Structure formats: C-alpha cells, structure tokens
Symmetry: D2
Subunit: 223 residues, 4 copies
Amino acid sequence: MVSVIKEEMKIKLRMEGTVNGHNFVIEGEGKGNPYEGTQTMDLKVTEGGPLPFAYDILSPQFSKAFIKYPADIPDYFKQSFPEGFHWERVMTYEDGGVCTATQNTSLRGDCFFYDVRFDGVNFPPNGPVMQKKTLGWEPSTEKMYVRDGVLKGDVIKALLLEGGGHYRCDFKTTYKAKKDVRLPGYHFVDHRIEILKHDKDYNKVKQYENAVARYSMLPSQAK
Amino acid sequence: SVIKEEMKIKLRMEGTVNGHNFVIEGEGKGNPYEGTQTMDLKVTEGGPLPFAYDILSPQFSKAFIKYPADIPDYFKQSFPEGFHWERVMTYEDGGVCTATQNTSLRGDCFFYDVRFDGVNFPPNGPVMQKKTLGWEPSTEKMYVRDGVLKGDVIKALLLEGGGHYRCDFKTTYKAKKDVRLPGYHFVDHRIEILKHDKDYNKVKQYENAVARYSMLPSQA
Amino acid sequence: SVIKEEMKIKLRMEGTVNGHNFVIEGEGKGNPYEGTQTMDLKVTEGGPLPFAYDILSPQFSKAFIKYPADIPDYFKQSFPEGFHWERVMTYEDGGVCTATQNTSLRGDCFFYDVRFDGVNFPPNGPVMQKKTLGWEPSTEKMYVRDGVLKGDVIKALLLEGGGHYRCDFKTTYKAKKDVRLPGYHFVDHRIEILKHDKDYNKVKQYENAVARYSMLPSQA
Amino acid sequence: SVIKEEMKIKLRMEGTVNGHNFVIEGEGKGNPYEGTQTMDLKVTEGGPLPFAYDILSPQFSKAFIKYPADIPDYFKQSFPEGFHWERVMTYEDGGVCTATQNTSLRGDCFFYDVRFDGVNFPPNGPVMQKKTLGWEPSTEKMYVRDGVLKGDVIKALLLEGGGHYRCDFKTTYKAKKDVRLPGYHFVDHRIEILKHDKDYNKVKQYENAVARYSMLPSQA
Ligand SMILES: [Ca+2]
Ligand SMILES: [Ca+2]
C-alpha cells in the first residue's frame, strides 16, 4: 500500500492521434485494482470514426499503475505518485508501419488521468492494419530495465490475424517518473490485453488488461 | 498550371519531442521549377527548444524539386488538389521521429501543416545535448509502391565532437489525385541553415533539390 | 522414441567475428524431456577469442526444451530426420550476427553444426572489449509462419559498470519432415556459465528451457 | 604504385543461404582508376543455387572506384597490404545477409576471399522465388566512424512484374594499414549482369563505381 493509490482507482483517458494521415480522438473511462494488476476501460471514438485502421494498434496505449508488483521488485510506477510519470514509445510493425506515442499520467484524488498522443505512418494500404484483419494481441511479457536513470520496457508483441498467423510489432518504451524513485533490477511484466466487448466498427470498446511483474520463472544455477 | 515560377509558402508545425510540446510557424519563398527555396521559421510555443533544431529542418517541401522533363513530377502534377506525406526517421541511437504533413495550395502560396513527434532520444545524446552541426547533403531514392511514391534516404548530421550521427528516412508521398507515376529515380538534396539566433528561436533555412537518374551510363 | 531420457551432444562451430576466424568444438549431455543440458566447449582455432564469448553461448539446442503435453513439440517431433535453424541477432550498437545450424541425430547423440558470423561491432563496444557479464533469463516467443516455426526474443547482456546491452533475436526453425505445428507459445530460457578458464578457451555452460502458455488466465 | 591501370581479380566465396551451402569461384579484370571491372563467377559447389543470384553480385571490389584527386582513396591507399570489409544487408521482408571479405594483392592480381550468409528469407519472397531483375544504380554514403570507413546505402532490386524490393546495406571497410581518411562523400555504383547460363551456375557481371562530393553547391 501507498496511501495515494487506493485499492480501487478510476481512470479517465484522452487520446489524440493520426494514422496514415487520418486524424481521430478517443475518450476513455475505466477503473481497476492497482495492487491486483487488473483494470477495465470503456473507450469511445469521439472524432474521426469509424476508424479506418485496426483498433488493436491503439489498445496497448490505454496504464502502468495497474501492474501487480511483488514487494521485492521496486514498483517504478506506483512510487512515482503523486507526481506521476510520462512515457514515450516506438512501435515498429514488421511490414513497415511505425507508430510513436507519448503519454502523460497524472493523479487527482482517486482518479488517474491519461493523455495520449499517437501517430502511425507508412502502414501498407493492403496490410492487416489498414484492412482491419487483426484479431487481438497475444499475451506478452515486457522486459523492464534501467537506462540513464529511467525505466525502459521492450517487448516483441504479435497480433493474431484473420486466417491464422501473426503480425509482429517491436515495442520500445521509456518510462520517466517525475520524481526520484527506487529503481528496480531487470525484470518481466506479463500482460494480457483482451477486448471484452465491441460494436461492429469498434467505435465503442470495453477492454481489460491483467499485468503482473516477476523475475524469471526458472531457478538460477549460478556456481 | 497553378504553380508560378515563384511561389510563397506558409507553414505550421506542432509536435512533441522527448515529452516537450512546441509550435513553429514558417513563411518562405522559392522557385519550384529551379529546385530552390528559403524559409523563415519562428518558434512560437515551447521555445527555446530543448533539442537540436536540425531534427526539424528536413520536415519544412516537395513541390520545389527541379524535375527534368523526362521524369514525371509526382508533386507538381498533384495540384491543385495537393498531397500529404508520412515519414519515419530512425536515428542510430534509438531516437525515432514520425511526421505527417499536408500540402495544399491557394493562389500563389503553398500551405504546409506538419505534425512531428520524437521519442526515446538518449538524454546525453547529440539531439538532447544539441551537439549537431547540420545535415550532410544527401540523395533520396524515389520509387513507386502501391500506386503512391516512396522516398528512402540515408542521412547524417555532423557532430560538434567529431564524426557523424546517422538517421534513416522512410517517407510515403500520397497525391490527392491520380498522376503520371515516375520510374525509380534520385533527388539530390542540400539543406542549409543560412541564419539562426543563439537558441534557434528564429531560423532562416535553404534547400536545393534536383531530380535525376543515375550519373552512371548503363553497360550492355 | 529415438530421443532417450539422457542424450549426448557433439558440436562444431565455425565462425568469423570482426574478421577473426575461429572454430569451437563442444561435447555435452542433457535430459531432453526435463529441459536441461550441460555442454563443454573448447576453442580449437583462433583462441583466445578477441570478442565476448557471451555472443556465442545462445548458439550452442532445441530438443532440450521441456514441452507440456498440450503444446506440440516442434523439435522432438522432427526426429529422426532432425531440423535446421537460421538466426539473425541485431545488437543495439550496430553489431549484427547471423547463424545457421544443422541438427542431426545418430544413436543417442545429437550432432550440431553451426556457422556463426558477426559484423560491424564497434571496436570500443562491449563485445570487442569483453565487457559483458552474461545474459539475463529470457522468453522466446514461438509462432508458425509459412509452415515453419519462428522464434523471436529481445535478449539483454549485462554490462560491466551496470546496465544492459540489448539484442534482437529472430530465428526460423525448419523441421526436415512434416510435424504437428504448435500454436503461439513461450519458451523460458536461462543460460549460465558454470566454469571457464581465463580467456574462455574452455567453458562449461548450462541451459534450462521450458515451454508454456501465458502465466495469466484469459477473461474472454 | 602497386595498383596498375589494368588489374586482374581472383575470388572465392563460401556461403549458406536458407540453409543451402555453396562455393563460388571468380576471375575478373578491371581498370581501377576508371572505376570499371568485369568478373566471371562459377558456382563450384551447391549448384544450382535455389535463390536469386542478385543477392550475391554486390559481394564480388572497392579498389575499382574512380576516385578524384580531392577525395582520399581509402582503398587504393591500403595496398599492398589491403583491407577487409564486413557487411549487413537487411531486406525489407526480413531476409538478412551478412558478409565478410578479405582483399589482398599479389603482383598484378587482387585476391578476394568472401564469406556470405543469408537467413530468414520468406519461402515465397522474391529471393527464394527468383523474381528479381538486378539492382537499381545506387549511391553509397562513405563516412569515417571509429577510425575506419563506413558505407551505408539504400539499394533496391527490380522485380518481375514491376515494383522494387528494398535492401539496406551497412558496411565497414577496414584498411590493414593506416591511410589518409576521407571526408563524407558518395560513391555512385551501377552493377549489371552481362550474361548467365540457365541456372546461374556461370555469371558475367560488370560494375562501374565513381566517387564524388554532392552535385549541389553550398549556399552557406
Ligand atoms: Ca543503435
Ligand atoms: Ca519488413
């Protein structure tokens, strides 16, 4: 327990972005259990819908305070409050599409406020993103390590495709606390992001993420 | 033809680099058929920029390439409707920038609206430490893919400490109407800062750009 | 069936890193169904190696992954015919390695033949200066593509002085016969050096590898 | 000088692509100060090659670049001792090739020893399906890094049926003795297949290479 982060917390989100020159805005509202690593958010496309690209490319941009951290791994995100943190992200898809995102996370009362900027370029016109042939993300494990006094997270994620097969994306994120925090050693955050409900064009989406931090499953054999 | 031999330019860029928001406005003039242009840039919000201005200069003009008669001019043909472009810029130390640009035309003036975003620049790298000294001249490689025009180019910034800092550009240019598509070709560029104040709040920038095929004849 | 509870391994690697040619011979043994193995490696040509031995250790064994019954085991299913694999390793400072490996089976012994090549390592980087302190444990992501099995993983080497040195692994595993293909899954790995002489001409290394689905339950 | 107006070439390459081993021997001759050369290549083991021969042609000669007097010639200066080079070749569909080359000189003949390795080529991509129609001409960008010479270039294979297939080349050239280092410059290349037999077991190829600065004058 950190007194400023309660056992149940609310979320409010705004995203502005551009994908292949198409502008859009998304608003979100959610709530979760930060120490349980679970959360649900309801997302609504408010400008630019129906999105001409796969909703899936956005869903990982929608919450690092909701990771279940064991007591022995320092929690970069929960320690950063009340000041909060921002993050910066590159997503390199294997067919030349590239997305950047910058996010600000602040805290007021029992509510987290997320402001996201998202930009995607060079998606092929007949590729799975602009043809909306994706079917959600496989579960993944982000690798968290310190670089220049801030926290990096890297993971190769994969979208399931219509017809089978996968579509890969290299995530490189830098997380930057707005005050000094105890820094963790190298570790893993398992993630599983799921779409619980969507309308036909994904104008209205309920999504859920479960995230848990850990060291490796395998024992050390160090001599 | 709706493009005169001398045209004005108006530009607005908004963006975020390393989490820092900024706005730049620009006015310029150029000779579209000569391949040359000059533009005056003012940082109107978020100044002084905490990162090297150089990462922005190549985002500030495709109608001002000198195209020979035997290479279709994808950009000039697109008017009056215009075109937009999309770009990823991958720096060798992990900094990555994206940019999206819309080009429209009214009267004797092109209007440029640019969104620019940079992430993951190392804090002691040359961009965040402002150690850059302008771009080398370069040669963009231009080729059609899926009915639009791509341009890829190896670029390099000169460094205060010596050596170069490398950036790979991959751009997609998308005309807003059907045009005569060009074959594979090259555009030589040289972007130069003519004048800047100490903090690069005000910058006078120049570019020369010329399309061509290879300088080397074919053997048979 | 052809794969017993204990199996021997014989290995030959021929390679060039930074223009330096070398040969490594290895003999090992392990328990394929338990996901464990030990190997003794000797640099027989080109030692002492002028680069970090760590870049080699992940090149030294896919039959030794503990596979649960509900995930098809691509590697064990491929025998007696065996499989080969192809790998690119992209280091964050510009070093790139490739490797091609053939895995065959004769009696109770696996035979590994590996070609390894490393190019463009910076002369003052951690690989050429031997500043690495082993790999962090990792999780390979395995997924089918074009009828064969790919594995992707971002790995990290620990560095003298603190911090990590990242490497993007992209492997394609290709069975020499038709097998049941698995769905998307994970293989946890931990590679450890048990013993080494001063210049790493002689190394005993150990690996534990276990395949699994996600740790997290699904809510759909 | 040790480098005459006409020089012979002898070459051997050993390689593995998509798990397929091969050996190629070559002999050629050229005019180092004119920037031109011709080579006859023969697949001596592993023919017929199951992949596009085009991926090999750029691995077959930097002493044959026409250098003007005001750019130091990194390669010619290195003789009689010579140089070696290292290269990564990242194709847009995930194929990656590495190569390491040693260049020596005896009498009036250059001796080239090449290792080549290609991995992760998609089985229905243009390389494994032999759908390529040679390289577009290109401009390699030369610059000093860590006391040696780097060359980076955007290259593109023309494809049967139209379109291009891109490959990024990153090379490090390493003289075996210290030489006068050049400033940032450009080497235009045009590499062409003049003649081949049915299975590309025998190939005659030609290259023209000329070093220069930018075409465009400085305004600043
Ligand atoms: Ca790098
Ligand atoms: Ca690709």
